[PDB]
Design an enzyme around this catalytic site. Structure first.
Site, short mmCIF file in Angstrom:
data_model
loop_
_atom_site.label_atom_id
_atom_site.label_comp_id
_atom_site.label_asym_id
_atom_site.label_seq_id
_atom_site.Cartn_x
_atom_site.Cartn_y
_atom_site.Cartn_z
N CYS A 147 3.05 -4.20 -4.35
CA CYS A 147 1.59 -4.43 -4.37
C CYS A 147 1.06 -4.43 -5.81
O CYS A 147 0.17 -5.21 -6.15
CB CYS A 147 0.86 -3.32 -3.59
SG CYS A 147 0.66 -3.68 -1.78
N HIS A 192 -0.91 3.64 -4.67
CA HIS A 192 -1.02 2.22 -4.34
C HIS A 192 -2.06 1.45 -5.16
O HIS A 192 -3.15 1.96 -5.38
CB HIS A 192 -1.34 2.22 -2.83
CG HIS A 192 -1.48 0.87 -2.19
ND1 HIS A 192 -0.54 -0.13 -2.33
CD2 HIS A 192 -2.41 0.40 -1.33
CE1 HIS A 192 -0.91 -1.17 -1.60
NE2 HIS A 192 -2.03 -0.87 -0.97
N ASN A 207 -5.97 -6.28 -0.29
CA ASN A 207 -4.58 -5.80 -0.30
C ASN A 207 -3.55 -6.96 -0.22
O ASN A 207 -3.92 -8.13 -0.01
CB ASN A 207 -4.40 -4.89 0.93
CG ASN A 207 -3.70 -3.59 0.62
OD1 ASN A 207 -2.93 -3.49 -0.33
ND2 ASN A 207 -3.95 -2.59 1.46
#
EC number: 3.4.22.40
Lengths: 444, 444, 203
Positions: A64, A360, A383
């Site tokens: 990510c 994250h 995301n």
């Protein structure tokens, strides 16, 4: 004896407490429900969801960590070449990030060879040397040496690019073997000894060999030209001849000199630079450094960056208070107070006591500023989990969630006020240096 | 005006009540949970389930209404022929039950032709004339005329035998047409008029014709011999030549003179016979009659029948307080009192006020009598819903559930005390006659 | 198993509070304290931890206390909620210990309230077992012959008289080539019941 006795679990006490709790109506309801369903599913508060799931934002932009770091650059190419759709190759950065980390680890083991095998650092070095997560400085370290290429030239074709766990475990087992071979050789010799130099090269060779079984090395070297044929949004065809390094500047417009990371880490004074010791990927690359600031400052920088029409890379503690099904990040969305479950530990203490950390990286692509003369109320978040997560991959995050469970944002130094920008340009700042295992670290 | 005003929903009142309820901790928990899950799933009480899901029974025997009524007879053949496995044909009874009900309805319409089309009885007659449910007297009516045959000769092969809804709807639409044709003809003529007699025969023909499209008429007539080849539990082969009528007595041992139904209907005095007016299937067959008794008497009869090693046909209100997943029938299994939901209406009133009725027939195959000198505590119950319902199709039912949501049991007249048996044998009893639409009626 | 699982978790939560009081002299970022904070109520154990639990709680038939609750087969959310509270508690205790001594009445009271709160939270996800260790339960069962029987016994008596456990006989051997053979190896602090036996292996 009295102390130990008082500190023990006493059967009469728990059964008497149990009798007391079962005389309360709320407790009786609570245990009925909570022996039947997961507490997050049972306590999700739809009355609150109705008010907070608000997808109207008055200030919007028009692995990510890799998707988040490269998104803007992707948009820059889209814009620069008049393209309908476009994707930068994340796999490209992924392959070099892993090769470099494996190589970095060998150097981390040589430099810590004076410590016992069971020391805190060495055990830490051995725990997860080739994990996938990174930081923004690690991304810039990779782009400066390798540049960038269109996904069309190097995609997510291999099994390991989307299921890296088995590959990492095989590399890691070899790296643990290597650590011992190196530390064992270093007892007899000096590190600059030709035997050690040779040993280390053979390890690099072996790491690369093993890596090449699971992913191909990219098709062109960083200063080597590739040829790329594409179609613009008008159906027109074109061919670009460029190198990955030139592509990253001339077409993706990346200037590695401008990005800086700000963080809200209340364990430390605001206005100080924070540096995470040893955290890195490319040997000799830049360190992970953040300028510590208060949330008011952090929130303002986000709003200002969005007004410049640019999304904001940020790191937070996913998935704390994040409802994946509805795509809402709100610390009051679940009715825990109705079962008497409250959480007074504050942010600095949550970090110190192993409760919260950055896990994250995502993108803030918009916000809603109270129309009058106030501040931001909620942010639009995106995301890299497919349009099936959240609302087509879209989340809404409250100002309070940003303050409490977000930590880092990345902006261009020119968006900072002079007093802050100089913390990075003066050479006068001595950073607060934290351990390699710090919670304010790598992001998935 | 004041009365109507007081009887209206006042917006200030509901919002003020809402404010009051939301100040209570239990209510707050309750609405959070109950906007998220079905109330039975959320309130199922596992602490209670742990205590009530007890499958130890000290007194055990060693179209649901059709399976329940024929089970014993099935066991009698199993036993009589030394068989490993055996099934009586339910489809056989199903085909004749439906043909007869369709025919019964035509007679019900001729006999009510003096009433207006919109009268309570005639509309009721038109609502569901060929439904699948029955009573035990309806089962005996069918066996007395048709007998019984092994499933091997006539199984559940046709679509309509296991999905009867479309077939019933097609027959029913025709029967509604027929009702009008008959009532219209009866305005001009008398019922015994040759035109009416002929009309009625043509309707029977048409009903049969339509029925034969969805199920075959059984392969042999009731007094006609069939040949049946089977294998005993020893792998030995045998052939029986018999008629359905002889099969039902000689091999299944049915004596239609012995079964009697007792019921606990507290709307009425105990010791009285109760007769449901018009409820039937075969024109001129026996009526649905029950001997009303108290639950203590009803529970004792069940225990005594089980001691004779015979299961007990009973009718109850399925699926009130029945948990299909765990197979438990317990009126306190769900924690409704924890959300303040209580139900004081008693059995007689629940029946009168449209809340409880008999809906389903099952079998009690065992019970647990308090080992000392007391009474039954729980019963073992079996259904015709596949081993995937309840626990392999096995349910446990509390004594309290039997008292409150069960009504009818069927036993042999010789198991009754003389004072009760004579209510059936004296010819002195005048039954309490109830309407055809009574809640104490047909069972699925 | 649920029976042992409920008490193992309650005890570990309680053990952790004592581990935090005894390490309060160390910095919050020390290797031990961070380690103590990482996973205080995890599900795993050792054989000595099992004997610690049976000696205090005994054993009961599954028929009396099964795996009915959600958390018994999906413990992750429950552990995370308890753990977040325990991390809060660690700070409250270390903060109180800077001013006071551990045997100080304020600390004793604080610790009891934490036990209460841990138990309260635990009882939302699993019921406390239906009988205390020296309390008799009644258990009805059917033998392989279809015959029915009733046993009246306590969990502690059940573990010895019917399950035949003699806690004095089990010993753990290990092949740990980091160490000489013939030596006992003891894992420091690893435990569940405060004051119970240590994890010891004969190499």
């Amino acid at each position: 004896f009295q102390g130990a006795m008082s500190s023990s679990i006493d059967i009469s006490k728990i059964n008497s407490w149990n009798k007391e709790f079962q005389s309360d109506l709320t407790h009786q309801l609570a245990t009925t429900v909570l022996k039947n369903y997961n507490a997050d599913d049972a306590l999700l508060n739809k009355t609150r969801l109705q008010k907070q799931d608000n997808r109207v934002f008055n200030t919007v932009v028009s692995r990510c960590w890799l998707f988040a770091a490269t998104n803007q650059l992707r948009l820059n190419v889209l814009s620069e070449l008049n393209l309908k759709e476009f994707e930068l190759s994340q796999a490209y950065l992924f392959f070099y990030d892993k090769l470099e980390k494996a190589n970095y680890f060998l150097d981390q083991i040589v430099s810590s060879a004076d410590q016992d095998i069971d020391s805190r650092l060495v055990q830490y070095l051995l725990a997860a040397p080739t994990e996938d997560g990174g930081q923004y400085s690690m991304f810039l370290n990779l782009v400066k040496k390798y540049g960038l290429i269109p996904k069309d030239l190097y995609g997510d074709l291999p099994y390991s690019t989307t299921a890296s766990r088995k590959w990492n475990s095989l590399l890691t087992t070899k790296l643990r073997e290597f650590a011992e071979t190196l530390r064992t050789a270093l007892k007899e010799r000096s590190a600059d000894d030709s035997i050690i130099v040779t040993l280390r090269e053979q390890m690099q060779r072996e790491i690369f060999r093993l890596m090449s079984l699971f992913m191909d090395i990219p098709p062109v070297q960083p200063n080597e030209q590739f040829t790329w044929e594409y179609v613009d949004k008008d159906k027109k065809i074109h061919t670009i001849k460029s190198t990955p390094l030139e592509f990253a500047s001339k077409y993706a417009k990346l200037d590695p000199s401008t990005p800086v990371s700000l963080i809200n880490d209340p364990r430390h004074p605001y206005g100080k630079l924070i540096k995470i010791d040893r955290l890195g990927n490319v040997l000799g690359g830049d360190a992970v450094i953040y300028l510590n600031v208060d949330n008011e400052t952090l929130s303002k920088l986000v709003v200002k960056r969005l007004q410049n029409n640019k999304a904001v890379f940020f790191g937070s503690h996913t998935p704390k208070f994040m409802d994946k099904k509805t795509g809402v990040m709100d610390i009051e969305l679940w009715n825990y107070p109705a079962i008497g479950y409250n959480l007074p530990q504050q942010k600095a203490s949550r970090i110190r006591y192993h409760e919260s950390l950055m896990t994250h990286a995502m993108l803030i692509t918009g916000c809603h500023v109270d129309e009058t003369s106030k501040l931001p109320l909620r942010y639009r978040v995106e995301n890299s989990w497919g349009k099936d997560s959240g609302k087509d991959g879209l989340y809404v995050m409250t100002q309070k969630y940003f303050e409490e469970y977000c930590f880092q944002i990345v902006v261009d130094i020119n968006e900072l006020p002079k007093e802050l920008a100089s913390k990075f340009t003066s050479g006068k700042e001595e950073p607060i240096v934290l351990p390699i295992w710090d919670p304010m670290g790598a992001l998935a």
